[PDB]
Write a protein that binds this DNA or RNA. Structure first.
Ligand code: K
Ligand code: MG
Ligand code: MG
Ligand code: MG
Ligand code: MG
Ligand code: MG
Ligand code: MG
Ligand code: MG
Ligand code: MG
Lengths: 140, 100, 70, 141, 307, 221, 184
RNA sequence: CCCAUGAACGAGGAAUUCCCAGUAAGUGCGGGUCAUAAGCUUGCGUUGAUUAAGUCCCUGCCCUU
RNA sequence: ACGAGACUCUGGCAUGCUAACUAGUUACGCGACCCCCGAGCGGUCGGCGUCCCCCAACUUCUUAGAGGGACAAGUGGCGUU
RNA sequence: AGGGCACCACC
């Protein structure tokens, strides 16, 4: 029984990928990875598989459960969780060399595939509609 | 015996944690099966109000808040033993509710 | 800016003048030594003092320093 | 093996609506040609057979998430209400439409009342939806 | 016999703080690091790389300060600045046991000869004796060092079972393992101490630290034998398993002394306004032909004893 | 049954009203504060507990009776006790009341303020500030400030290092305002001052001078 | 595995003729991405936007005016359809067309108005202003017209790449450089 | 709430406001007010940029002679 | 010496610690449905249950306590250095 | 006369 559970975050969206020894299945909330909406950003989800090849994923089944945030943030959380889950599975049940090479590929393409973006919404302050904008000022 | 649930509530985290630790230490000394302190989400009561008593000047606001922290402890013990354990000195500001 | 105030600078100078033999060029060891030998109320202040201690130790190894009399 | 979650949901809804209309045992209210589906709508639905589409959508939602009542359905089909010169706000769907859809689905025996309240799919309804999903997958392939 | 540079191991992302080798597996070594991981290296000795990272042991919250390998080569014992010790199953790379009780950074760990006991020295100025199940059998704090306990070691000779400890109070102490009571107290050094090592025969104990002097003590006699001069701060001391040598990591360089002649055999200097990387740890191979040295540039260097 | 939010707000409101009532009732008796420990025990801190107790406890019994009647406690459930303030000179409320009654007694403003300042400083405070505002001399109003020692104004440490009190004095010509601020000394024990030191104060341990060994010496234990 | 934008357009054959702009038009190699949507922090530091892929910079500049603020999925779809239209109309690589349009639209000399004085224009500002002019021309062509925004963007890019005077960006660049010459 | 009625307004002169990163802007949701109740305010998330890393030209404030 | 800074709250990190039927995960058992084909250690399930007479392990996700973590600390350049 | 600072100044 070889499995890992690795999360990825984007804003308030959090996706946990369970990656176990398998035949190459990838699901998000029980749906095929190609069925996740919006499909404008389908390549964002497919990027880990396109970069690493289907051969790396051929030996694992990955099921992703995602919640919170919005549509785009969930897309980014899913892709980050898939990449981090594959890296963790490789570093735990395969050699360190394979983990290093796949991690290098992912990092070279995009660092957010492995490292979470820490940006969060800034608090509103009184005297304006938002964090920085102020209400219009009149003089006469 | 009976299953005893102790709910502790406070506005002071440090005193709340001290009381919880003392209760768990007492339960351990009495050799009781005690579920650790389950921490409920902290409640933040907020009141935002204008600073000025009149209506003049730059519209500045005070953001007052109160934080309520809640803990749960589960015990399998007789009621008398539970009361004896809860009879220890309780720090001020901590409200304890025992249910059987 | 990263200008350290007189609190940090004076604490670092006194620490170096009193415990020069236990200090070195390693920030983390200096931080442990500072927290062992001084009461510094906050972790951030401890880190700033240890960092300036490390900087001054490098300067002292490179040559004499006016502020510190060892 | 094909289940609902394996197919495109819009295509599945269209196929299931066509299946319900072809079966023709679904009870349709007399006022389907007069009403609009919510107070935040401006016009009645463009599709004359909107009732079958709504029933298929409701059955799919019950498949995905059982125990939903009329209030949950009105939340599902709610949308943005524009208020003229005033800001827009969320608004719920028509309770009569949701209730009639649920009752018609119960009449088809695809839907039964849940023990804890609300509605759920019967095993027959689950089987019908999975067969429709298989047909959709076959058509796509 | 002059040692030459053979290769480098480039896995770590922080200072290499300790290197461990075992006689059972000549192709496997361990390296602890400040990147909070312990790398198990498989030695290929190929043209491309001398060795590559085989496995990474993770679970420490702070710097890993010291690592040792069990006699059978199946388990590893590590200490860390997070104040805990960990026992690792090398086959799976998971932690089998956690040792808690030190209130500050754990600076040194050591296995007994039969691996039935574990000794740990920490910044809390306390020495702790444990069993393999993670229970602190004994805690020496009354007669212990007045400063950080920087290194603790076990004697390999079971005839006189003793523990050798060195701390930042410039003292070397000997403890009777039977009762964990002080036996000998050495007051030679003038600066804080970084390391104490014991000869394979158990007769010799070498101590080194800030003052740069490597002082030899007779464990049987209980007296100071002599003193060797190292230019820089001594970071690590190691006795050659077969040759009558003493190896010291003096600043950026490595000095080997022939104890028979008390003279320098060789000086291992890395080929270069920045200070050179410091050597932090030394470990001889099982056969004694290969010396592994850890440095502050996140590298391990391999020196081969060449005729 | 009542929600926890409402329960905590209600307990706070009860303490606020009780403190206000005791402030108005026992101002001349040196009242400084009240502690409510749940029978419900109510501890009244005062400089002159004899006047709080009254003739054979008559006044304290009256206070217990009115408290019980107003707040709806069951008869006999609430008990009131009186205690003396440990360091009268370090209580801002006590000093403000003392200054208020000195001013009501016709004492000169400068004399009364300087007397209070000297008493506070002799009590062990790091520093103090006394501000008296109003129609001190003539119709035009002004404020006189008397400061001594160290005083901090900004940041979190003000919350636990500075004790503040504001009081009103009803004179013939109008109201005078009294503000008393006392910077408490650092007390590791925690009795007269905060245990936590000032956050920007770094205290460096003086090393113990030691003699380095000239020659290696070994001892046997 | 070669990476093609939208899975259709390759970057290997794209050539940047102007050597001054070669360091400020990120289009190939490490800058080849499947989509013009990276959610990167290119505005964190100065000059870092030079690393942002040029297609994504165009997509960002299409999110105007206010009513379209933040609708990056819509602008990505617009750019995809515009590239499809460009390929149909010209037979060329849409990336090559975009690069040529930017090169031809960037003004090389401007006036600073300190009476005005002529000054040179840095390559980064050249790229910035080229993108701004192209997007502005497309938007103004599409406003109050049955022609869609994707078609207007495709026409603007094609004309700018050809250097034709039918391009809003080309006309604005010519006016700016003429004024700079006058104030020289 | 329903049916019906279907005005100005086709991007706004002189002038002028706010703002640099999860920010501006778009978008909705809570709290306060509240029997009835948000075009206000105070918070929250969601989508998410262009431009700049400079200056004393304007408006001010400050320092020296 | 006050003010600035320090400070308090907040945001971001921890597969390390503490530990949860008013949070969950994974595993297993039962059940529903799809695929005869390639019917399985299959797929989907916010369907039920597993300290709660007795029947399962854990804390990644959630909550919230303790501690850690960042110091212009490392390298290069400029600077009176 | 010279020198600083600020999207409640400008660029
Ligand atoms: K149009
Ligand atoms: Mg906003
Ligand atoms: Mg809706
Ligand atoms: Mg201060
Ligand atoms: Mg401040
Ligand atoms: Mg109002
Ligand atoms: Mg956790
Ligand atoms: Mg203005
Ligand atoms: Mg302007």
């Amino acid at each position: 029984l070889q499995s890992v559970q690795v999360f990825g975050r984007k804003k308030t969206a959090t996706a946990v990928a369970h990656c176990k020894r398998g035949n190459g299945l990838i699901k998000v909330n029980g749906r095929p990875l190609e069925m996740i909406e919006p499909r404008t950003l389908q390549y964002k989800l497919l990027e880990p598989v396109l970069l690493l090849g289907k051969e790396r994923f051929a030996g694992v089944d990955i099921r992703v459960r995602v919640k919170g945030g919005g549509h785009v943030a969930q897309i980014y959380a899913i892709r980050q969780s898939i990449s981090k889950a594959l890296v963790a599975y490789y570093q735990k049940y395969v050699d360190e060399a394979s983990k290093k090479e796949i991690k290098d590929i992912l990092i070279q393409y995009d660092r957010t595939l492995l490292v979470a973006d820490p940006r969060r919404c800034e608090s509103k302050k009184f005297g304006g509609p938002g964090a920085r904008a102020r209400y219009q000022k009149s003089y006469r | 015996i009976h299953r005893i649930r102790i709910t502790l509530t406070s506005r002071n985290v440090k005193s709340l944690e001290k009381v919880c630790a003392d209760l768990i230490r007492g339960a351990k000394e009495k050799n009781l099966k005690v579920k650790g302190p389950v921490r409920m989400p902290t409640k933040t009561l907020r009141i935002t109000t204008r600073k000025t008593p009149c209506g003049e000047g730059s519209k500045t606001w005070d953001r007052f808040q109160m934080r309520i922290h809640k803990r749960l402890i589960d015990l399998h013990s007789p009621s008398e033993i539970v009361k004896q354990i809860t009879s220890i000195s309780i720090e001020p500001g901590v409200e304890v509710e025992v249910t059987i | 800016g990263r200008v350290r105030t007189k609190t940090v600078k004076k604490a670092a100078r006194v620490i170096i003048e009193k415990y020069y033999t236990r200090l070195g060029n390693d920030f983390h060891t200096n931080k442990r030594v500072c927290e062992e030998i001084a009461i510094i109320p906050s972790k951030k202040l401890r880190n700033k003092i240890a960092g300036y201690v490390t900087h001054l130790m490098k300067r002292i190894q490179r040559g004499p320093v006016r502020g510190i009399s060892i | 093996g094909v289940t609902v979650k394996d197919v495109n949901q819009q295509e599945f809804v269209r196929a299931l609506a066509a299946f319900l209309k072809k079966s023709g045992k679904l009870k349709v209210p007399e006022w389907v040609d007069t009403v609009k589906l919510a107070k935040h709508k401006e016009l009645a639905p463009y599709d004359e057979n909107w009732f079958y589409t709504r029933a298929a959508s409701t059955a799919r939602h019950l498949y995905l998430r059982g125990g939903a009542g009329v209030g949950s359905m009105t939340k599902i089909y709610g949308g943005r209400q524009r208020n003229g010169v005033m800001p827009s706000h969320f608004s719920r769907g028509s309770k009569s439409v949701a209730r009639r859809v649920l009752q018609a689905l119960e009449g088809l025996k695809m839907v039964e009342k849940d023990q804890d309240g609300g509605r759920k799919l019967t095993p027959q309804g689950q089987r019908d939806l999975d067969r429709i999903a298989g047909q959709v997958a076959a058509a796509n392939k | 016999e002059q040692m030459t540079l053979r290769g480098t191991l480039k896995g770590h992302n922080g200072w290499v703080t300790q290197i461990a080798t075992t006689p059972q597996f000549p192709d496997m070594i361990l390296s602890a690091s400040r990147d909070k991981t312990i790398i198990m290296w498989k030695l290929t000795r190929d043209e491309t790389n001398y060795g590559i990272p085989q496995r990474a042991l993770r679970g420490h919250s702070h710097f890993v300060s010291d690592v040792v390998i069990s006699s059978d080569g199946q388990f590893a014992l590590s200490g860390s600045w997070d104040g805990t010790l960990r026992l690792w199953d090398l086959t799976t790379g998971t932690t089998t046991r956690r040792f808690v009780g030190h209130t500050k950074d754990v600076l040194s760990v050591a296995f007994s000869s039969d691996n039935r006991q574990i000794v740990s020295g920490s910044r809390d100025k306390t020495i702790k004796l444990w069993n393999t199940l993670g229970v602190c059998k004994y805690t020496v704090q009354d007669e212990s060092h007045s400063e950080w306990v920087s290194c603790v070691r076990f004697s390999p000779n079971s005839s006189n079972p003793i523990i050798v400890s060195c701390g930042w109070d410039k003292l070397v102490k000997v403890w009777n393992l039977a009762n964990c009571k002080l036996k000998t107290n050495h007051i030679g050094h003038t600066g804080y101490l970084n390391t104490v090592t014991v000869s394979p025969d158990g007769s010799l104990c070498a101590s080194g630290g800030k003052d740069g002097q490597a002082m030899l003590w007779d464990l049987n006699e209980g007296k100071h034998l002599y003193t060797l001069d190292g230019g820089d701060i001594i970071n690590a001391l190691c006795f050659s398993p077969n040759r009558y040598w003493l190896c010291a990591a003096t600043g950026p360089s490595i000095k080997i002394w022939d104890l028979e002649g008390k003279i320098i055999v060789d000086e291992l200097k890395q080929e270069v306004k920045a200070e050179p990387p410091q050597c932090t740890s030394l470990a001889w191979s099982a056969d004694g032909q290969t010396l592994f040295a850890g440095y502050t540039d996140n590298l391990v260097r391999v020196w081969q004893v060449t005729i | 049954q009542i929600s926890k939010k409402r329960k905590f707000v209600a307990d706070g409101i009860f303490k606020a009203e009780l403190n206000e009532f005791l402030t108005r009732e026992l101002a001349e008796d040196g009242y400084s504060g009240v502690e409510v420990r749940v029978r419900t025990e109510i501890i009244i801190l005062a400089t002159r507990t004899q006047n709080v107790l009254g003739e054979k406890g008559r006044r304290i019994r009256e206070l217990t009776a009115v408290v019980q009647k107003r707040f709806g406690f069951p008869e006999g459930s609430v008990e009131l006790y009186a205690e003396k303030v440990a360091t009268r000179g370090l209580c801002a409320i006590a000093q403000a009341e003392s200054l208020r009654y000195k001013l009501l007694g016709g004492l000169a403003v400068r004399r009364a303020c300087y007397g209070v300042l000297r008493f506070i400083m002799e009590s062990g405070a790091k520093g103090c500030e006394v501000v008296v505002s109003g129609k001190l001399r003539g119709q035009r109003a002004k404020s006189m400030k008397f400061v001594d020692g160290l005083m901090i104004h900004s940041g979190d440490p003000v919350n636990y290092y500075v004790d503040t009190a504001v009081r009103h004095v009803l004179l013939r010509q109008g109201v005078l305002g009294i503000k008393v601020k006392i910077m408490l000394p650092w007390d590791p024990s925690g009795k007269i001052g905060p245990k936590k030191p000032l956050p920007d104060h770094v205290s460096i341990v003086e090393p113990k001078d030691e003699i380095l060994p000239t020659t290696p010496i070994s001892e046997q234990k | 595995p070669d990476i093609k934008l939208f899975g259709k357009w390759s970057t290997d054959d794209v050539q940047i003729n102007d050597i001054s702009l070669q360091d400020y038009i990120a289009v190939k190699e490490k800058y080849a991405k499947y989509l013009p949507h990276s959610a990167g922090r290119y505005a964190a530091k100065r000059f870092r936007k030079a690393q942002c892929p040029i297609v994504e910079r165009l997509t960002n500049s299409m999110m105007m005016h206010g009513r379209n603020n933040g609708k990056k999925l819509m602008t990505v779809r617009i750019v995809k359809h515009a590239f499809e239209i460009i390929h149909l109309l010209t037979g060329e690589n849409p990336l090559q067309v975009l690069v040529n349009a930017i090169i031809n639209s960037g003004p090389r000399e401007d006036s600073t108005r300190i009476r005005r004085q002529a000054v040179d224009v840095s390559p980064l500002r050249r790229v910035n202003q080229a993108i701004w002019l192209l997007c502005t021309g497309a938007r103004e062509a599409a406003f109050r017209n049955i022609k869609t925004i994707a078609e207007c963007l495709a026409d603007e890019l094609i004309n700018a790449a050809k250097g034709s005077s039918n391009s809003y960006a080309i006309k604005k660049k010519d006016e700016l450089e003429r004024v700079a010459k006058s104030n020289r």
